[PDB]
Structure formats: structure tokens, C-alpha cells
Amino acid sequence: IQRTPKIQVYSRHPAENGKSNFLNCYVSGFHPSDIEVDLLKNGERIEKVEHSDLSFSKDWSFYLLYYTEFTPTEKDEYACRVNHVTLSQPKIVKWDRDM
Amino acid sequence: FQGPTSFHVIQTSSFTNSTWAQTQGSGWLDDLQIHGWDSDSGTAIFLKPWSKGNFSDKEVAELEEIFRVYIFGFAREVQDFAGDFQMKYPFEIQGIAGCELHSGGAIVSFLRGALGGLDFLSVKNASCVPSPEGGSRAQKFCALIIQYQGIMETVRILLYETCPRYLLGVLNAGKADLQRQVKPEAWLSSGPSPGPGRLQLVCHVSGFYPKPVWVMWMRGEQEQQGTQLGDILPNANWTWYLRATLDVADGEAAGLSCRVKHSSLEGQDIILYWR
Ligand SMILES: CCCCCCCCCCCCCCCC[C@H](C)C[C@H](C)C[C@H](C)/C=C(\C)C(=O)O[C@H]1[C@H](O)[C@@H](CO)O[C@H](O[C@H]2O[C@H](CO)[C@@H](O)[C@H](O)[C@H]2OS(=O)(=O)O)[C@@H]1OC(=O)CCCCCCCCCCCCCCC
Ligand SMILES: *[C@@H]1O[C@H](CO[C@@H]2O[C@@H](C)[C@@H](O)[C@@H](O)[C@@H]2O)[C@@H](O[C@@H]2O[C@H](CO)[C@@H](O[C@@H]3O[C@H](CO[C@H]4O[C@H](CO)[C@@H](O)[C@H](O)[C@@H]4O)[C@@H](O)[C@H](O)[C@@H]3O)[C@H](O)[C@H]2NC(C)=O)[C@H](O)[C@H]1NC(C)=O
Ligand SMILES: CCCCCCCCCCCCCCCCCCCCCCCCCCCCCCCCCCCCCCCC
Ligand SMILES: *[C@@H]1O[C@H](CO[C@@H]2O[C@@H](C)[C@@H](O)[C@@H](O)[C@@H]2O)[C@@H](O)[C@H](O)[C@H]1NC(C)=O
């Protein structure tokens, strides 16, 4: 079978403009394991990004956590972009500090 | 006691074509990674200073040898038998094996395998049992594995003798980290409108350990049954994140509070007011 990914974006701490935080993109529920995940700042790829080693759930579906330090500002837009064999194009999920 | 009560290793082996297999592997206590695996050399990466538990450096090197030889050997054999088993590329195999401590002191061991993201086999009382979703392929596989010298006896010893020793030893070795209590922070926001004259009240709870947590919206002592909990999501530092949302009328927010209870906060419940 195959499974499309779920994508959840969230900061570690409440956002405070100009204060250092961690931006997280949790990608889960997908199969097969090959996947491409970028964090974006104003539409451009962030270079420094950390991720977990691959793991999977009880139903055999995979999951990964991508994360980077960042400083939220008022202007700057952040997002997670995922590509997977099950998607007819890349999925982009924006960070929204109020969700 | 609190924190994890099980240890397991996983395997993900991805077969692109006859030339190209890749295997990814790791060791876990529940949800917390404690071993990595460097695929190319076939060696373990110990992620915590107590990840060897109470095992000797010699027994650990011997276990890494077992897993190295299993991983390359398995990948080679799969590639060599893919024609016979009518496999189409690409395909992906997964495995999980380990043991778990039950409330009465009983330790139960398990091993399961997958193909195509579906159950393929399991080990039940020392034998290979094919799963229904694996079909005639899984039957063939379990009829074949018993022909290999030492495989089934090694799997037996690792599951039922080695794993329970390792698990009690590492839960004891890592107990200062594993049973630590870490208090969350919490905060409120107004989420995307769920509709005209409605507000989405969001209560965020982040940085708790261990994982079990309780979060509810309230009007004084009254639980709001409309509370929706999100997924518990990981942070990178061995803590978790969760939101609880309540869809409320635009004039009904006042008097509402988010209440958080956690093992680290006994006598210290967090209560946050919207207005
Ligand atoms: C922390 C604790 C947590 C615990 C929880 C985990 C709990 C559970 C974790 C599960 C992990 C399972 C690991 C079990 C694997 C066993 C160790 C991997 C091996 C250990 C060293 C002794 C064993 C008994 C066999 C050895 C050492 C061995 O060398 O085997 C060969 C032996 O070296 C040689 C004489 O030297 O004769 C044959 O080798 C020939 O045939 C092979 C297969 O065709 C060829 O690849 C090989 O080149 C060839 O050599 S040749 O020179 O003869 O041609 C033997 O053939 C053989 O019998 C095959 C051995 C070679 C690897 C083949 C693996 C493929 C099948 C795997 C399916 C099993 C999955 C589980 C399903 C339920
Ligand atoms: C690493 O640690 C393991 C586990 O040891 C224990 O847990 C740690 C944290 C300490 O608190 C120890 O006090 C505990 O013993 C050790 O494994 C065990 O070794 C002891 C000593 O040989 C074994 O105790 C014997 O067990 C017999 C009866 O118990 C039966 O029930 C258990 C339930 O767990 C079952 O697992 C087991 O099959 C037993 O048959 C008894 O004959 C004898 O008198 C004595 O009580 C104990 O059983 C072992 N536990 C397990 C789970 O295997 C390791 O030896 C240690 N080192 C290494 C290198 O592994
Ligand atoms: C432990 C304390 C200190 C040491 C720690 C070292 C830990 C580091 C992590 C190690 C991680 C790597 C090891 C990973 C081992 C995971 C074990 C999980 C076992 C389950 C896999 C079972 C099989 C998986 C399911 C099998 C599916 C088969 C699909 C059909 C393929 C058909 C084509 C050919 C088939 C024929 C092959 C014939 C073969 C003899
Ligand atoms: C076999 O595979 C080689 C590797 O291809 C790829 O690498 C792997 C890890 C996958 O990520 C896959 O998506 C890539 O396409 C090929 O480069 C090679 O040509 C292939 N050989 C033959 C004969 O088909």
C-alpha cells in the first residue's frame, strides 16, 4: 500500500518577535520511507536543518521530525515543504503562531 | 515507575533494484531513541552515556556483529531470491523486535516484519508465523527460514534471553534521565476562526516529560466537553507538545480557562484565563 504524509508545523516556545526559538516540522503517517523535507524562510530553503533518524509507528507508517533554531519576526514567513511519491506536487504548510 | 517500559530495535530495508539496497536501523526505549546505526560500516552509535545498559563492551561488540552480519546477509539473500518470490522493484521491508516489562514483573518479547507497509510475519512462541496480509509469499518465507543453520535458535536466544536482561539493565542504568520530571509551559492564542461569530480558543502545552498529560478547557469547575485534543508531538529534547482547542461563541470566551495537569506538577495545576 502507500500513505500520504501528515505535516504539522509548530514552534517549541510561544513566539516572541526577535527572540530565539525552535521551528518544528513533524511529518508522519507516510509510506514508503523516501521523502524530501525542507524548511523555508520567505520561500527560500533554510540550510542548517536537523532531523531525527527514521522511525515508524505500530501500523508501519513512518515519521520524522525536522527542526531548526530561528527568530520569529513580524515580516518573515516560515513553512515546511514536503515531497513524496504519493503527492502530485510538493505540499507546503505554513507556520502560524496562533494555531 | 514512570518513563519507558520497553526496548526495541527497528530495521527499514529499501530495495530499489538488484544493485541498490539500503538499510536504516535504530534502538529505542518506547519513543526515545537510544541507539543509532551507521549503515555503511555496520556499527552502532550510542546516543546516551548509559545506552549499553549493564552489558560488557565485549557482549555489545558481539551483538553489533550479529546485527551487521544479519543486515548485509539479509539484503543479499532478498536480492538473490527476489525473482523466485516474484518481487517487483522498488519494495520496502521493515522489522521490529524487542521486549516489554508488564506491571506484574512479566517480560513479554515480540518480533514482527512487514512488506509494502503491511504485516508480513511475526514470531509466536519461538516460531515464524506468516501473517494473512503476506499471503503465499509469507508462507514460503517461514517454510524457508528454518533451513538456515542457527537462525531460529539465535532469534530465540536474543528475544527470550538477551532482550529481558538488557531491558532491566538499561532501565536501571538510565533511570536518572528516564524517570526525571520536566514541567511544561503553557500559553493561549486565538486560532483561525471556525466560522461567523465563533472563536477558536487554543491552549498550548510544551516541554513536558514524561508523555502522559491532561488538558481541558473549563468554565470554572465545569469541563467543556467540546474540548478537542490535538496529537502529542515531539520536540527534539525529549519533551512533548500538545494543543487543546475549543470552538466558542465570540461573546462566550470570558470565564473560560485552560487547565493543565501533569505528573511533574502535583499540587501545581496550570490554569490560564482567556480574559
Ligand atoms: C540488545 C538485545 C536486543 C535483542 C532484540 C532482537 C531480537 C531478534 C533480532 C533478530 C535478528 C536476527 C539475526 C539472526 C541472524 C543470525 C546472525 C546474523 C548470525 C550469527 C553470527 C550466527 C548465525 C547462526 C549464522 C552465521 C554467523 C552465518 O555466517 O550463517 C552462515 C554461516 O556463517 C556459514 C558457516 O560460517 O554457513 C552459512 O552461510 C552462507 O549462507 C548465507 C546465507 O545465504 C550467506 O549470506 C553467507 O555469506 C554464506 O557463508 S558461506 O561462507 O557459508 O557461503 C550460514 O548460513 C546461514 O545460516 C545464514 C547466516 C548469514 C546471514 C543470513 C541472514 C538471512 C536470513 C534472515 C531472516 C531472519 C529474520 C527473523 C525471522 C523470524
Ligand atoms: C544485568 O541486569 C540483569 C537484570 O538484573 C536485574 O535487574 C537489575 C536492574 C538488578 O536490579 C538485579 O538485581 C536484577 O536481578 C541481570 O539479569 C539477571 O540476573 C539475575 C542474577 O542471575 C537473575 O536472577 C535469578 O533468576 C532466577 C529466577 O528468576 C526468574 O524470573 C525472571 C523474571 O525477570 C526471569 O526473567 C528469569 O528467566 C528467571 O528464571 C533464579 O534462578 C535465581 O536465584 C535468581 O533469582 C535474573 O533472573 C536475571 N534477569 C533477567 C531478566 O534475565 C544480568 O545478569 C545483568 N548483567 C548482564 C551482563 O546482563
Ligand atoms: C542491544 C544493546 C547494545 C547493542 C545495541 C545495538 C543496537 C543498534 C541498533 C541495531 C539496529 C540494526 C539491527 C536491526 C535488526 C532489526 C530486527 C527486526 C527483525 C525483523 C526482520 C524480519 C524479516 C522482515 C520481514 C521479511 C519480509 C520478507 C519479504 C519477502 C522478501 C522475499 C524475497 C526474498 C526472501 C527470502 C529471504 C530468505 C531468507 C533466509
Ligand atoms: C539502480 O538504482 C540506482 C540508484 O537509484 C536511486 O538511488 C536510490 C537510493 C533511490 O533513491 C532512487 O530513487 C534513485 O533513483 C540507479 O542510479 C541505477 O541506475 C539503477 N540501475 C539499474 C540497472 O536500474
Which of chain A's residues have a Cβ under 8 Å away from the Cβ of B188? none
CA distance B275 to B267: 24
Q: Which amino acid is at B64?
A: E
Across the strands, what pairs with B14?
A: B22, B92
Torsion of CA B114, B118, B120, B121, to 10 degrees: 80
CA distance B222 to B268: 19
Give yes or no for a contact between B188 and B243, defined as CB atoms under 8 angstroms apart.
no
Torsion of CA B36, B14, B116, B160, to 10 degrees: -40
CB pair distance less than 8 Å for B235 and A31? no
Comparing alpha-carbon positions, the chain B residue that sits nearest to A21 is: B235
Can you read off the three cell numbers belonging to residue B25? 536501523
Which residue from B188, B183, B182 is spatially nearest to B243, judged by alpha carbons?
B188
CA distance B195 to A4: 28
Query: For residue B117, what are the CA distances in angstroms to A3, B81, B97, B206, B268?
Result: 9, 20, 16, 32, 44
Looking only at the bridges linking them, the beta strands covering B6-17 and B32-38 are unpaired
Full DSSP string of B135-166:
HHHHHHHHHHHTTSTTHHHHHHHIIIIIHHHH
Which member of B96, B189, B241 has the closest CB to residue A98? B189
Which of chain A's residues have a Cβ under 8 Å away from the Cβ of B98? none
User: If residue A21 lies in a helix (H) or strand (E), which one and from where to where?
Assistant: strand A21-30
CA distance B273 to B257: 4
Q: Which amino acid is at B75?
A: A
User: If residue B69 lies in a helix (H) or strand (E), which one and from where to where?
Assistant: helix B57-81
CATH code, B4-179: 3.30.500.10
Give yes or no for a contact between B178 and B3, defined as CB atoms under 8 angstroms apart.
yes
Query: For residue A74, what are the CA distances in angstroms to A12, A78, B103, B153?
Result: 18, 11, 51, 62
B60 lines ligand 2 (CB under 6 A): no
CB pair distance less than 8 Å for B14 and A33? yes
Angstrom resolution of this structure: 1.9
Q: Which amino acid is at B205?
A: V
Within its chain, how far is the Cα of A19 from the centroid? 20
CA distance B204 to B219: 18
Which member of A1, A50, A96 has the closest CB to residue B118? A1
Beta strands in chain B (DSSP E): 6-17, 20-29, 32-38, 43-46, 91-101, 107-115, 118-124, 127-130, 185-190, 198-208, 213-219, 222-223, 228-229, 233-234, 240-249, 256-262, 270-273
Full DSSP string of B153-203:
HHHHHIIIIIHHHHHHHHHHHTHHHHT--BPPEEEEEE-S--STTEEEEEE
CA distance B48 to B7: 14
Q: Provide, for chain A, the percentages of residues in helix, strand and coil under a 3-state DSSP scheme, each rounded to the nearest 5.
A: 0, 50, 50
Give yes or no for a contact between A91 and A81, defined as CB atoms under 8 angstroms apart.
yes
Instruction: List, in order of start, the domains of chain A with CATH numbers.
Output: 1-99 (2.60.40.10)
Rg (CA), chain B: 24
Indicate the domain borders of chain B.
Answer: 4-179, 180-275
Can you read off the three cell numbers belonging to residue B62? 558481539
Q: Which amino acid is at B67?
A: F
Which residue from B78, B184, B87 is spatially nearest to B134, judged by alpha carbons?
B87
- Residue of B200, B231, B233, B239 best to disrupt the A interface, most CBs of A under 10 A: B233
CA angle, B208 as apex, B203 and B211 as ends, to 5°?
100
Comparing alpha-carbon positions, the chain B residue that sits nearest to A9 is: B233
Local structure of residue B32 (DSSP, 8 states): E
CA distance B202 to B244: 6
Domain at B180-275: CATH architecture: Sandwich (2.60)
Reduced to 3 states, what is the DSSP secondary structure of residue B57? helix
Q: Up-side HSE of residue B121: CA atoms within 13 Å toward CB? A: 22
Exp. method:
X-ray
